[PDB]
Design a binder for these strands. Structure first.
Ligand SMILES: [Mg+2]
Ligand SMILES: [Mg+2]
Ligand SMILES: [Mg+2]
Ligand SMILES: [Mg+2]
Ligand SMILES: [Mg+2]
Ligand SMILES: [Mg+2]
Ligand SMILES: [Mg+2]
Ligand SMILES: [Mg+2]
Ligand SMILES: [Mg+2]
Ligand SMILES: [Mg+2]
Ligand SMILES: [Mg+2]
Lengths: 169, 292, 159, 204
RNA sequence: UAUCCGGUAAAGCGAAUGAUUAGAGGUCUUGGGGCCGAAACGAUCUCAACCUAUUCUCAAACUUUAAAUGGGUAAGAAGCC
RNA sequence: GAAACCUCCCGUGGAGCAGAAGGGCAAAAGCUCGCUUGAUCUUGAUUUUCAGUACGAAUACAGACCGUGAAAGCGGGGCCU
RNA sequence: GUCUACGGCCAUACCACCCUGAACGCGCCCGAUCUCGUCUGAUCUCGGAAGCUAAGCAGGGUCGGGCCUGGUUAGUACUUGGAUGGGAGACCGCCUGGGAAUACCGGGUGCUGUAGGCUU
């Protein structure tokens, strides 16, 4: 009989790190835009790495943060391609989880020889009512303690909500 | 495991930030520029029209700063407004206007400049400001303390500021962030501004919801539907309130007495209680372990 | 031969004390100096506009001018053989009221009280101060118990 | 090779540690500041013989090491290979200098010759713990070790338990109290203060 | 007699910075070498760095502390009311 | 993959602030944007080196003409040396 | 008793975890038509008032860390002035006045200004 300790999805994060720049990245930005229904953001590199073939302030990745119902919907699709399995290590100690998909057309998108097959990266910021405290301007705070989502608590939310297994190893 | 970031050491070397900086209240960078006088002005005050919008309220205070703790010459709250006419939407831009206006009038009534400096009456919305009359006591002048509010176009603080300006305080300002001013053109309507001052932005939303879906309107404007505040009633309501403020701004409080004087709180546990309490935990551990 | 630089050797002087860095708390700014206020100068690291020179830190002097956010302040600086009363324009943040004078004003006020009264009475009262006189004749009662004997203690080597 | 010990004896200069500024310093002769059964428990060695200094003088790293070998050799030969623990309690930190002559006294400032310990009057140089059997064997060990140092140093047997800061008269009771708790060569003094959960680990 | 100024002596390093000894504890890390292992955070040691309490010993160009001696002012008619 | 991008947590500054080092600095003095030319015109006063001359460097004002900000303000080069 | 708004001094006010919060507040909270701003109504801006003290916030708790303040350390370390004092030196003792700092052990754990609530 808890009032608002209702573990919800605060946001869903999606990022395609092509690590190229130019055209490949502009191509991958269309994929997220088709998926999420909003323009994404290009992130640039921190610093040059001659190994990976990247340069400082060169656009490496594209990403986006989905919120609300659309984030619930896209999360659902992403678990369907993963078949509602995660692991213990897929959850972070902070009570967030995430998982890859190897190819976006699995979610439900049409391939093109140009706009190819960008594998991508789901990550779910779980939260509660009254987490905003941390990130507002004026009278800020820290979210107590018996209110912070545990790893265990986030696993059981997944185990209930999306009927998942959380396989061991 | 990792290196403990917050050691003895960490706390020994640690410096707190000021109390109100911790509480997330006082921008001391801005406070210094706002509040201190030029030393050659000496003890002449430096007033500021503080305006803060709470989740359910708008406060308007005039204050100068002394060393004991900035003194408040006058105040007006949005929750007073029921007296004057405003039943609902007390955090809205129109309410902000009333609340500011009321502060000016109440302030002016103290100094006897109620008859001099009527200020703007008809509410155009355009650039207005008070010229001090010669052979008469000059116009009161303070400055707007926005606080931590993101000072954008249409911010409710500037709703209050507009009010106190029309009320007859000379507070300097531009019209670059009254609601009306256009970013991609750079002119000011001052009929858009009037609408906002009169609550027509709210009335139209009320009319838009009722047209589309009854239930959402019923949900959105529940206290507006109770008290029977309708879209077509709205403009009149705020104009009545403006007049009533303008005719009597004086605050009378309530004669508070008949207090039982009882402790809701929990007082501080005395040394000796604390001293025994460990004594009992020490015993209780010993007697407990001498069994299994 | 040492460098003539303005700030040479103020590593410690202009350095906010331990756990008193950051915002210059506001009383400092908002307290009023008139003409002829006795004022002790004490440079500060946070505010670098209007800093006094390292020679006038510690030194007390009188205010002569007061601008918008600073105070002209005559202070006496010795130079080999000659003391030069000279006038410096310190920004408020590096300056306090020197209490040195207030204890004097307290005493003169107390004298004016004790001069007005004791005039109608007739009994004249000691207005001048007097240094601590020798400590008067008095008895000491070794009440019952006798004195406690103190033998010096025998040496031993600890370390 | 190096200068006589004569020439670097009195604590004349300011202390000049190996640092950013003083660099290219040759490594100290002495390195291993303790030897014998150092992996021993407080209980199984309470004697604490010290060689205390009685001159505000500088001791060479060279002379420390030599004194350390001298004492340990005798301790081994006397009682046994694992029957003591010796602690040297002066590390050569001060860097000593050397203006060398093939210009004259122009631009004379030394290169780092070597390191040195500065030792105050009443400061301990070496210290030894072993058994109540073995008092005399330590004394002579420190006695022999004196001859490697310049100046003058008393040999003294402290009123502490082992290399602890606690007076040996009260050491055993304190353990019975659990004021004190064995902790390798040392002993952790527990006080009242800390949360009661620490107190519940003891008494259980 | 009031009142400011100070960062030297000393002291400190279970307080920062840098130095530095030892054992307790720790698969934190991970390794490189082993021994018993096909191999296994399996067992057993080990030495690397890191960390949890302790511990040895230091600083002209480090310091939480912090003297003595020391430098300002002030102690009235150019003042009070 | 030890290093690419994203996300949550801790983080008294252990980063950064053109350069030596010292000081100073966290809803900044750091970073990122928006608008800019106060690095403009003009009297004296003062500080620092000092002989208490110059130079340079700086501090407080004052008068103009601007900038920016809702405003209080800040700005006549570079946080200070 | 206690809160809100603006505060002064800035840890006796910080951090950690634990418990309790009547009324009024303060919040979280529900929305994006308009103002405003985002990749994203998360923040920011704006319009609300169905829920709830879970969190923030307050008050308390902990043989808590930390900070503050006493003791001890110690008349010890240091030190002004003195001697045709000692000592081969290094250094030390006395006279004359001044006099610290850890470890260790106690106690304390925000005070308060202006304006306005609530407990009628
Ligand atoms: Mg501001
Ligand atoms: Mg020879
Ligand atoms: Mg020398
Ligand atoms: Mg110095
Ligand atoms: Mg020293
Ligand atoms: Mg700059
Ligand atoms: Mg000007
Ligand atoms: Mg929202
Ligand atoms: Mg709560
Ligand atoms: Mg609660
Ligand atoms: Mg405590």
């Amino acid at each position: 009989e808890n009032p608002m300790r209702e573990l919800r999805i605060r946001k869903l994060c999606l990022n395609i790190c092509v690590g190229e720049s130019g055209d490949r990245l502009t191509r991958a930005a269309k994929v997220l835009e088709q998926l999420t229904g909003q323009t994404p953001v290009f992130s640039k590199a921190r610093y040059t790495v001659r190994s990976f073939g990247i340069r400082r302030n060169e656009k490496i990745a594209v990403h986006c943060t989905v919120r609300g119902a659309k984030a619930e919907e896209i999360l659902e699709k992403g678990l369907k391609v993963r078949e509602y399995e995660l692991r213990k290590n897929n959850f972070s100690d902070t009570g967030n989880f995430g998982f890859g998909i190897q190819e976006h057309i699995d979610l439900g998108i049409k391939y093109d020889p140009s706009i190819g097959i960008y594998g991508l990266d789901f990550y779910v910021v779980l939260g509660r009512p009254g987490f905003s405290i941390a990130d507002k301007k004026r009278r800020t705070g820290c979210i107590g303690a018996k209110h912070r989502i545990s790893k265990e608590e986030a696993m059981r939310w997944f185990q209930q909500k999306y009927d998942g297994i959380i396989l061991p190893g | 495991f990792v290196k403990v970031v917050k050691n003895k050491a960490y706390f020994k070397r640690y410096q707190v930030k000021f109390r109100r900086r911790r509480e997330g209240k006082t921008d001391y960078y801005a406070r210094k520029r706002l509040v201190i006088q030029d030393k050659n002005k000496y003890n002449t005050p430096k007033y500021r029209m503080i305006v803060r919008v709470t989740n359910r309220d708008i406060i308007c205070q005039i204050a100068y700063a002394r060393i004991e703790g900035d003194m408040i010459v006058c105040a007006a709250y949005a929750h007073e407004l029921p007296k004057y006419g405003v039943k609902v939407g007390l955090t809205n831009y129109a309410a902000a206007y009333c609340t500011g206006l009321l502060l000016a009038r109440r302030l002016l009534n103290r100094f006897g400049m109620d008859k001099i400096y009527e200020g703007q009456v008809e509410v155009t919305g355009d650039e207005y400001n008070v010229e001090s009359i010669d052979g008469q006591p000059g116009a009161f002048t303070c400055y707007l303390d926005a606080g931590l509010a993101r000072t954008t176009t249409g911010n409710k603080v500037f709703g209050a500021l507009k009010g106190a300006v029309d009320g007859g305080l000379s507070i300097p300002h531009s019209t670059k962030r009254f609601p009306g001013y256009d970013s991609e053109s750079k002119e000011f309507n001052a009929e858009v501004h009037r609408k906002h001052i009169m609550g027509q932005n709210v009335a139209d939303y009320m009319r838009y919801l009722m047209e589309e879906d009854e239930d959402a309107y019923k949900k959105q404007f529940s206290q507006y539907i109770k008290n029977n505040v309708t879209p077509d009633m709205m403009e009149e309501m705020y104009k009545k309130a403006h007049a009533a403020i303008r005719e009597n701004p004086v605050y009378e409080k309530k004669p508070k007495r008949e207090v039982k004087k009882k402790r809701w709180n929990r007082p501080k546990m005395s040394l000796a209680q604390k001293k025994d309490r460990v004594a009992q935990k020490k015993a209780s551990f010993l007697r407990a372990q001498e069994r299994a | 031969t040492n460098t003539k630089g303005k700030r040479r050797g103020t590593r410690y002087m202009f350095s906010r004390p331990f756990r008193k860095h950051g915002v210059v708390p506001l009383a400092t700014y908002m307290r009023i100096y008139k003409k002829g206020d006795i004022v002790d100068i004490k440079g500060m690291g946070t505010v670098q506009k209007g800093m006094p020179h390292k020679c006038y830190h510690g030194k007390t002097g009188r205010v002569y001018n007061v601008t918008q956010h600073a105070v002209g302040i005559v202070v006496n600086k010795q130079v080999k053989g000659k003391i030069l009363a000279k006038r410096i324009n310190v920004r408020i943040e590096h300056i306090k009221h020197s209490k040195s004078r207030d204890s004097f004003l307290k005493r003169v006020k107390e004298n004016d009280q004790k001069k007005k009264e004791a005039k109608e009475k007739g009994t004249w009262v000691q207005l001048k101060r007097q240094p601590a006189p020798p400590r008067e004749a008095h008895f000491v009662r070794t009440n019952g118990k006798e004195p406690e004997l103190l033998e010096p203690i025998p040496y031993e080597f600890m370390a | 090779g190096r200068r006589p010990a004569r020439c670097y004896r009195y604590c004349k200069n300011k202390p000049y540690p190996k640092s950013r500024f003083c660099r290219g310093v040759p490594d100290a002769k002495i390195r291993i500041f303790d030897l014998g059964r150092k992996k021993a428990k407080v209980d199984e060695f309470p004697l604490c013989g010290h060689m205390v200094s009685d001159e505000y003088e500088q001791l060479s790293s060279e002379a420390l090491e030599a004194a350390r070998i001298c004492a340990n050799k005798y301790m081994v030969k006397s009682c046994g290979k694992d029957g003591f623990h010796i602690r040297v309690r002066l590390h050569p930190f001060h860097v000593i200098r050397i203006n060398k002559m093939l210009t004259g006294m122009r631009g004379a400032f030394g290169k780092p010759q070597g390191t040195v310990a500065r030792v105050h009057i009443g400061q301990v140089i070496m210290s030894i713990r072993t058994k109540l059997q073995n008092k005399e064997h330590v004394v002579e060990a420190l006695r022999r070790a004196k001859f490697k140092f310049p100046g003058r140093q008393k040999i003294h047997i402290s009123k502490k338990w082992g290399f602890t800061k606690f007076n040996a008269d009260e050491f055993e009771d304190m353990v019975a109290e659990k004021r004190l708790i064995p902790d390798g060569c040392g002993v952790k003094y527990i006080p009242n203060r800390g949360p009661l959960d620490k107190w519940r680990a003891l008494h259980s």
